Write a protein that binds this ligand. Sequence first.
Ligand SMILES: O=C(NCCc1ccncc1)c1ccccc1F
Ligand SMILES: [Cl-]
Ligand SMILES: [Cl-]
Ligand SMILES: [Cl-]
Length: 163
Amino acid sequence: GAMAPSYRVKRMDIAKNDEECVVNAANPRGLPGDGVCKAVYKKWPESFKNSATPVGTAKTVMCGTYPVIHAVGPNFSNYTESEGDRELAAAYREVAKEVTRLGVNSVAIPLLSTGVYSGGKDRLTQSLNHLFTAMDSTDADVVIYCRDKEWEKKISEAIQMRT
Ligand SMILES: O=C(NCCc1ccncc1)c1ccccc1F
Ligand SMILES: [Cl-]
Ligand SMILES: [Cl-]
Ligand SMILES: [Cl-]
């Protein structure tokens, strides 16, 4: 574990992370996709061998010795708010199991189901709170990666609020 497990946020490409493993915001079919998923495909294409996994699950595939955790959040275009919320919470619980199993001291994570899978709604708070519920019992250093300065400030404020 980390000596003093922490949460941090950075506004940059998760493909340039400084952590011991990465969470991909994957599609269920293991396809290159767009956004975080395409950057992850360009950086770690070997990790997409047999990466397909259902919604609400995470599947780890090694790129060399570097673990890529493919986490499949729901597409809120297709799910009800209620069922989507359940699957989004589940995806993060499976990420916490994988991070623990791998024995890493740090993980780079995106906010699942907040972009092309958001169904056109702001899900910063919803996605971040499910991330916290899952990861709070892990002792890895968590570094959250986002695209926009607005969200960088809101994620930073949410982390600082808990102290
Ligand atoms: O800002 C948003 N999402 C995070 C950034 C992001 C990343 C990748 N593709 C798209 C958007 C957002 C806010 C309100 C409604 C819909 C949104 F998608
Ligand atoms: Cl960047
Ligand atoms: Cl998304
Ligand atoms: Cl983001």
